[PDB]
Amino acid sequence: KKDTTSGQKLKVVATNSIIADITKNIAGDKIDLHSIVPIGQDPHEYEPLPEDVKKTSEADLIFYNGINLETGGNAWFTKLVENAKKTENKDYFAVSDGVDVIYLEGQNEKGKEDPHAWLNLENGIIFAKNIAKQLSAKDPNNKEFYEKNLKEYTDKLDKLDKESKDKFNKIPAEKKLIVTSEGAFKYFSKAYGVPSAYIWEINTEEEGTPEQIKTLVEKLRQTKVPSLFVESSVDDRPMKTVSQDTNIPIYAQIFTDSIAEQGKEGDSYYSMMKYNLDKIAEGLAK
Numbered sequence: 088k089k090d091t092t093s094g095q096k097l098k099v100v101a102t103n104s105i106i107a108d109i110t111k112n113i114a115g116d117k118i119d120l121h122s123i124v125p126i127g128q129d130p131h132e133y134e135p136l137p138e139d140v141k142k143t144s145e146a147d148l149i150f151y152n153g154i155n156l157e158t159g160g161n162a163w164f165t166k167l168v169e170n171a172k173k174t175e176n177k178d179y180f181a182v183s184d185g186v187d188v189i190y191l192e193g194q195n196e197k198g199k200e201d202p203h204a205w206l207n208l209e210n211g212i213i214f215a216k217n218i219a220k221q222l223s224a225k226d227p228n229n230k231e232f233y234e235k236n237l238k239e240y241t242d243k244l245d246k247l248d249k250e251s252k253d254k255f256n257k258i259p260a261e262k263k264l265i266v267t268s269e270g271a272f273k274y275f276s277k278a279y280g281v282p283s284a285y286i287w288e289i290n291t292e293e294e295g296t297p298e299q300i301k302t303l304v305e306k307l308r309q310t311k312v313p314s315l316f317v318e319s320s321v322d323d324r325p326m327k328t329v330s331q332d333t334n335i336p337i338y339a340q341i342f343t344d345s346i347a348e349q350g351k352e353g354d355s356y357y358s359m360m361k362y363n364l365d366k367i368a369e370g371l372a373k
């Protein structure tokens with residue numbers, strides 16, 4: 088589509104820092120990249136700022152999660168691309184295309200998917216493949232470079248994934264449960280064999296009401312779970328109350344919907360996943 092050598096770098100927009108980071112690993116300095124949702128902020132419901140609107144409108148390529156991630160705020164991503172006059176599978180692409188979808192509990196229809204596919208490293212590899220292919224389709228002069236970066240990156244994710252299938256077999260069955268504010272661990276639970284439980288299933292619902300806290304506390308009181316976890320991108324008040332009512336300490340802050348701030352541990356898709364795996368493993372062995 089574009090002969091970037093005879094003009095500007097490809098202009099790329101990613102909806103959140105996880106997709107942006109994977110993108111940076113594939114494209115390097117070949118592109119101009121803008122990420123919309125700030126590090127540490129919820130990507131489910133976001134209100135685009137003037138710079139997001141400008142960059143999205145000037146973009147050659149737009150990557151979003153798809154599978155019911157950016158749909159809060161009465162479909163914020165949908166309104167953004169409508170306003171920027173961009174077309175699906177021409178200008179903007181879901182990087183989850185090709186993952187095996189898991190839906191919200193008791194649901195199975197389109198638009199009711201659980202969006203947290205990247206917490207399974209096999210799906211992070213699928214995100215990178217979609218990104219590299221769409222980068223190469225739009226900027227064919229840099230295809231060998233994107234492909235070389237893709238192979239090195241998926242090899243690195245693949246080694247971490249294989250090695251991480253050994254992580255939780257030592258945890259006693261009564262300790263074996265990941266607890267987070269949002270129910271964002273469905274793909275991770277399936278991939279790494281560790282059940283998960285939450286305060287609220289997906290960020291677009293209610294914010295950690297007293298009923299939701301009480302429901303998790305009562306479930307937790309029937310277990311031997313030694314640690315709780317709190318995500319970097321949600322209010323930690325709900326989990327602190329759960330922690331206080333159950334007497335179970337919050338072992339660590341983890342990463343779900345955002346990478347960590349630049350320079351801190353977890354500041355990339357790879358390192359947030361590596362971090363998550365180790366801290367959950369330590370936390371559940373307490």
Ligand SMILES: [Zn+2]
Pocket residue numbers: 131203269271289290343344
């Ligand atoms: Zn989420």
